[PDB]
């Protein structure tokens, strides 16, 4: 899937063409198309959890837009099509307007109406055997919970309880054929697992950033990959997990393991359930990773490096004024409006010109 | 809810679900790594008593069509598939594979670990398996008939897949433009080809012709007297199912097309004839070769091709008598792939020069064939 | 199908609810649903030939318009219906809005996608195999001849030579379980034949009007049951035209023969085809068989009392104003304007106060 | 394209489409006027070896269901209608009209003129006939067999549906909310009936469960001694195909039962029987009785009941015995209705007081014979 950068472009025109407009691109596996789909959806990097609704079902105007973006294509384009399901339009329909292969969007209309159900029984009606037919679907955690109106971790405890976890099958260009001595995997719900994690040495864990986008290059993905290098070097057993098919860290032979996933608490959790790391690096990758460093430390992840408090620190406007405070540095004028006239009064205060960040 | 299971001789089980006829299927499970070409690997009669489990999750994309078929019916015992796809999109389809396999009456699960499961077989080797679909599938019956079966190898398939009576075939191959084209009147092909149907796949035919061969094909049985009456241009010997060992009347017919001068040209259950008929022995695979990306190296030319195939058993190639060969070889395993008679016009290939499914890149060995004869003509 | 006049009341909440706003209705017979839904269609009386369009394919905004015109119910809902079908809804999408039953749904849909291969294969695709389905199905040869972009005429012309007729089944209130000596009939195209018309007397045909509306009500089907009632006393065989269910004028009483038909070109001339009457009336059953008189006559139906032409005479406002001139009679002071400034003008003179008739 | 067609004896024929099974179909062709219950109707044993024709222009609505068969199979021999609706559509529904037929393995023919059918029977009177579904329907094979066919008039066909063996029924009508009942126990059936299966219903036999009766089902050619056998609180003879006429076992077996105080009752073929057996006649009507809205007159009470008919043949009331007094009578065409032993408690009724499909109306057929067995028991 392509990633596209147009809200830093507002002037700009945000429909798909012959000229390429996207910035960079997130690549999945899956043992089925929807799983495939959906776990690349979910690696996007784009705040989706999957099929997110993207207009209201109460929404009077609702086919119009929908029928737009899916007559003209933008990049969101994707999400329009699940809502023309919803809002009921027809395969044949929504094929007259995208010219998008039936055999594609009758599997995303399996999954709208999968979803459907979902919403109607809640949590309640999550049993196993269904929990796990949406597992073999691609469905995320996050994107269940919110149908049932959960938290994403009473999901994944949901799993747990049932014992409901993914298996890792390897790449080896010969489906099978051939024995493989490498360690490139991917995540899907089926039998047998493949991963076959060592006990023998410690293991750290590189967290990529996912496919890239202006602020988030390659330059995040090169600190990566010498995280890798050199730790294997030191004798570390290094395990990378990302999903952009363009850079070096998805290369296999930059690591010794590889696990070509999204860079979610999910995926991530999942992974390191089975190998059990010594730590995990999570300061290398950008935002991605970054955004995840709590959750996951409270997962009980080994997170190694500077702590995700320490991080926050330095982040949180608050906590850093009060440091900066504290060691007696110079910081420029600030403060924290709400409405508009306390700004107005505010400013006064602090001093134009000024720096106004939402 | 449809149940379907499949157990393996092993006990190792598969719970699935069916997408084919209700009831119980038997025979020797294989894998295929085919990405496309499913239909035409079901209608191969060369996997009769087989039990056939596609490595490309997605089966049946494309629906069916009666041109995509290699024979006239459905050859393979059952059918093993990740998932079955909520519709066929091609313009090319008639017919749904769920339909079409209902059609055939044939038993077929889906839903199951295709990859675990060929896994099983790379490693361990091919095992006899049974499918059961209906209300609910008995494990222990399963595993029962799935031990019971008796075993492909010692198996003659050929003489129960041949042809009743003789025949002629005069048409070609498909086209986009033109689909099938009808049949070629006889007068309008030169040369006379004699076939002999061990269960012979229909774009071997087309592909004959194709290249100015008439066909007669004749029943597998058919004695080399029977032939030579004929008087033909060359002659020809199929593929088809089980052990080519036990088809002790090919062999001897063989024998005789060999003292002749007539030109002889065999593919894979043909080259094994072939091969038996000149002194070598054959051998079962432990798994065999089931796909269409097959490496196999022209060691005269040295030459790579992409072929396709489908055989269990292979021509050992220590055995090999000295008027005899080595012609071809599998980059992916070393095995024999092709031979020629250092004495006679005679030679044969272990892939499928035909493909169907899969690349043409092995077509030009029918060239040859082609060659042999009117040279054989010429004389 | 219920008759509204929402036009007549601007001001008005034109929704339907649990209050009645129809000021009338009509009726019709066929064999099947396809048949006699789009029979009650064509002898509406509001200018449908069957399921003519609301809104137009390449309007942005019709999938909005159409999903208001579903959820909540006017008078037009039924043409939106199909309209909908158009624009790529599905059925379980309409029936979502509508709540009503897929079993009438689906059969909507499928006349819909027969009316898209008319209009792809044209007139030329018309072959008696494929018209004589389409008849079957209701379909109206005014609506056929829209589709393939030709004169209803050419349509008729068509089935003649075809020789694609309708045949006339009676009511029997018994299935056909016993024989009946009424003659209470309806059209459809199937292969045996009921009519069996007189060749005894000198028949006389009389239209009715169809469904009432405000202007066209009792009292012209008053006036035409009189007629059939007298001439009928007088000697003659009546026969009566007409498919106002709530009228006296079709009560198999009323008349010799009564044909519950669509009072249409199409549906009057293939009873005139069969019955070759003596006479025709079209000046009592209003606005509807006044409308028909010309294309009767020309058809070479024996329209009688005042002519088609004479009444064209009365109501065009040319020929009158001519007349009336030529009698020496006394008329209101008339211009025909154009444009406003020109209308400002005449007004002028004319004199205030002015009648504006469109 | 899926042709069909449909052939009278008399030449006529109808061209249609194919809307269940490939094949032919051969036998006496009848119109019921049901607008509601083809499943149940298709479902009547009574209808063996008919070719059904439906005068309700669209048929299959409402799709089909279990609790909608009267039977373990379709009996009809085809099926004819007007129209095949696109989608069933109803809660109960389970499988499509044209998919249920294909399972029974049913020919079916759609878009023909039923009315015209309809009334060239009515006029003419019954007529064999042959449905022929297939890609080519030769319409002078199909005239072949409707001409050959035997006929309906003494074709004893209760032998042919009933069952092998004995056995027990406990189990009631269906409802609504509950759907069908478990089958009772027989501790909670007061009376012990004995009913003759000449291929009978299965809600006659729910209703008198519902009424309190434990139900033994004998086969059609059951003794009157083994009967007598079992003790039974009340007798009774079930509905079904063919010509009464011709079923010597029972008419013999009734006589004896109608030598003792033993309450008879029966419905339809039961009746017939019961005429038979007191010495009255059968005749075969011209047409017939199918439908369900057929008013009969109980001319006792001098009230009208509307009524389910399925019946070809009538007991003559201008033979009947002066032991055989008429308790009902066709408000339609003046037939015999229903009778009544005026020397014995044995009665029966040519309609259907189960109906299923059809008005309730005449279920109070069902009280009086329990009365019967009430006081029976008295003694
Ligand atoms: N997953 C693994 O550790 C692979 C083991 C072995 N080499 C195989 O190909 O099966
Ligand atoms: N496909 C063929 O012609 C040869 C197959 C052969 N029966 C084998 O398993 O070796
Ligand atoms: N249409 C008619 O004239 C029918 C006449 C005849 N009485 C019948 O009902 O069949
Ligand atoms: N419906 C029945 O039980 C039997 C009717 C009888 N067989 C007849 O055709 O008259
Ligand atoms: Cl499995
Ligand atoms: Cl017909
Ligand atoms: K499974
Ligand atoms: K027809």
Redesign the interface.
């Given at each position: 899937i392509p990633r596209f950068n147009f809200e830093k472009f507002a002037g700009a025109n945000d429909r798909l063409t012959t000229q390429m407009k996207s910035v960079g691109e997130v690549m999945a596996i899956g043992?089925?198309?929807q799983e495939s789909l959906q776990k690349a959806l979910r690696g996007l990097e784009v705040g989706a959890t999957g099929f997110d609704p993207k207009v209201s079902l109460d929404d009077?105007?609702a086919?119009?837009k929908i029928?737009?973006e899916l007559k003209d294509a933008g990049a969101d384009r994707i999400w329009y099509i699940a809502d023309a399901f919803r809002?009921?339009?027809?395969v044949?329909?929504?094929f007259?307007?995208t010219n998008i292969?039936?055999?594609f969007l009758?599997?995303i209309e399996?999954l709208v109406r999968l979803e459907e159900k979902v919403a109607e029984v809640g949590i309640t009606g999550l049993n196993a055997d269904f929990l796990r037919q949406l597992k073999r679907k691609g469905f995320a955690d996050a994107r269940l919970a919110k149908l049932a109106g959960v938290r994403e971790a009473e999901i994944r405890k949901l799993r747990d309880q049932y014992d409901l976890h993914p298996v890792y099958?390897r790449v080896d260009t010969?489906?099978?054929?051939?024995?493989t001595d490498t360690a490139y995997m991917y995540s899907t719900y089926?039998?047998?697992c493949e991963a076959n994690p060592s006990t023998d040495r410690e293991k750290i864990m590189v967290l990529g950033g996912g496919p890239n986008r202006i602020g988030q290059g390659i330059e995040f993905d090169y600190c990566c990959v010498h995280a890798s290098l050199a730790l294997r070097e030191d004798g570390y057993e290094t395990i990378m997990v990302n999903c952009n098919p363009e850079t070096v860290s998805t290369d296999y032979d930059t690591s010794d393991r590889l696990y070509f996933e999204p860079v979610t608490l999910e995926d991530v959790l999942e992974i390191v359930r089975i190998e059990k790391p010594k730590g995990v690096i999570v300061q290398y990758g950008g935002q991605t990773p970054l955004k995840l460093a709590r959750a996951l430390e409270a997962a009980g992840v080994p997170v190694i490096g500077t702590s995700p408090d320490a991080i926050d620190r330095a982040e949180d406007r608050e906590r850093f004024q009060h440091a900066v405070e504290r060691l007696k540095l110079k910081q420029p004028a600030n403060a924290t409006v709400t409405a508009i006239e306390m700004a107005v009064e505010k400013a006064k205060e602090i001093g134009y010109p000024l720096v106004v960040r939402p | 809810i449809k149940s379907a299971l499949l157990v393996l001789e092993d006990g190792t089980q598969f719970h699935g679900r069916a997408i084919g006829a209700t009831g119980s299927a038997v025979g020797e499970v294989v894998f295929n790594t085919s990405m496309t070409g499913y239909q035409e690997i079901l209608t191969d009669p060369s996997y009769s008593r087989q039990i056939v489990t596609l490595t490309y999750p997605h089966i049946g994309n494309v629906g069916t069509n009666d041109a995509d078929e290699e024979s006239s019916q459905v050859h393979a015992q059952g059918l093993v598939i990740r998932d079955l796809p909520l519709i066929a999109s091609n313009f090319r389809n008639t017919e749904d594979l769920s339909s079409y396999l209902k059609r055939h009456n044939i038993v077929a699960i889906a839903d199951i670990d295709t990859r675990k499961l060929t896994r099983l077989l790379r490693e361990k080797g091919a095992q006899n398996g049974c499918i059961i679909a209906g209300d609910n599938p008995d494990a222990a019956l399963a595993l029962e008939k799935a031990r019971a079966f008796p075993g492909l190898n010692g198996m003659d398939l050929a003489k129960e897949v041949t042809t009743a009576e003789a025949y002629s075939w005069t048409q070609g191959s498909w086209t986009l433009t033109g689909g099938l084209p009808e049949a070629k009147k006889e007068d309008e092909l030169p040369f006379h080809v004699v076939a002999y149907d061990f269960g012979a796949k229909r774009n071997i035919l087309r592909m004959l012709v194709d290249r100015g061969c008439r066909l007669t094909i004749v029943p597998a049985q058919t004695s080399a007297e029977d032939v030579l009456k004929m008087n033909p241009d060359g002659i020809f010997l199929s593929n088809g199912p089980g052990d080519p060992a036990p088809c002790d009347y090919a062999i001897t017919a063989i024998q005789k097309f060999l003292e002749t001068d007539i030109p002889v040209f065999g593919i894979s259950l043909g080259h094994q004839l072939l091969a038996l008929a000149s002194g070598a022995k054959t051998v079962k695979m432990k798994f065999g070769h089931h796909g269409g990306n097959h490496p196999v190296k022209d060691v005269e030319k040295n030459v790579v091709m992409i072929t396709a195939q489908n055989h269990g058993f292979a021509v050992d190639e220590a055995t090999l008598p000295a008027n005899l060969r080595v012609t071809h070889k599998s980059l992916f395993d070393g095995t024999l792939q092709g031979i020629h008679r250092t004495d006679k016009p005679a030679f044969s290939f272990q892939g499928h020069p035909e493909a169907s499914p899969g690349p043409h890149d092995a077509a030009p060995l029918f060239d040859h064939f082609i060659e042999l004869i009117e040279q054989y003509r010429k004389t």
């Open positions: 043992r089925t198309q009077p105007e086919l119009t029928r737009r809002a009921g339009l027809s044949d329909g929504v007259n307007l292969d039936r055999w009758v599997q399996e099958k010969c489906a099978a054929e051939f024995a089926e039998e047998e | -």
